[PDB]
Design a protein around this ligand. Structure first.
Ligand SMILES: [Cl-]
Ligand SMILES: [Cl-]
Ligand SMILES: [Zn+2]
Length: 223
């Protein structure tokens, strides 16, 4: 009968939401499931708990933006397992389904920095204008120059760290230095899953993300 929403919420990435935020996320996730299909492929079977959690992850980055920011897709295709040279090629080609895999979704529940759902949502936010993926989501025109400035500076800063300490030890996943679209998506993963690594390191860009997402995940870890 009922979806197991309360249980669904009990995962690390969602653990610091206020009770208000948890109830609002639950309503949006319920609406998500009304409006979009989660299509499990190749024999994968997703339980109501899994379905509920996946919906809530999709809704997290748009909690204060609204479900209409996810209008760029009708379906989500979920493979059991993973199959990013072709990934980024695909990214910069848009109404297509979001494509995920279950192994990476399960990792997306923890508070590690990695979140494939948030990553893919970020790409949809970047292209919501109908524009090609540029690492810049829908923001006022006067801010674009400054956004791109701060984004590209962060990308070079990530490359500098990779050159100094190596890929394995780098503070932000090295994939962020790939290109601006990937930088936005990877830093969006940190914004929600590991804000403590983002905010101190890129204060100007952090402020821009807070204002764009209308959320402050670091402050939320305070009460
Ligand atoms: Cl269940
Ligand atoms: Cl968090
Ligand atoms: Zn990507």
């Amino acid at each position: 009968a009922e979806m197991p929403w309360e249980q669904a919420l009990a995962i690390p990435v969602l653990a610091h939401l206020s009770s208000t935020e948890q109830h609002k996320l639950t309503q949006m996730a319920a609406r998500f499931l009304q409006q979009k299909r989660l299509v499990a492929l190749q024999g994968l079977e997703l339980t109501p708990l899994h379905q509920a959690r996946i919906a809530m992850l999709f809704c997290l980055p748009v909690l204060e933006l609204g479900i209409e920011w996810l209008d760029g897709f009708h379906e989500v295709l979920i493979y059991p397992a993973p199959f990013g040279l072709v990934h980024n090629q695909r990214v910069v080609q848009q109404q297509g389904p979001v494509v995920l895999n279950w192994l990476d979704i399960q990792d997306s529940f923890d508070a590690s920095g990695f979140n494939l759902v948030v990553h893919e949502v970020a790409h949809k936010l970047d292209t919501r204008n109908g524009d090609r993926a540029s690492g810049v989501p829908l923001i006022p025109l006067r801010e674009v120059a400054g956004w791109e400035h701060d984004l590209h500076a962060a990308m070079n800063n990530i490359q500098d760290e990779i050159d100094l300490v190596g890929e394995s030890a780098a503070s932000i996943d090295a994939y962020a230095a790939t290109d601006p679209a990937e930088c936005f998506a990877v830093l969006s993963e940190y914004f929600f899953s590991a804000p403590e690594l983002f905010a101190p390191r890129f204060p100007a860009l952090w402020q821009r993300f807070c204002h764009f997402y209308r959320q402050d995940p670091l402050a939320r870890r305070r009460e």
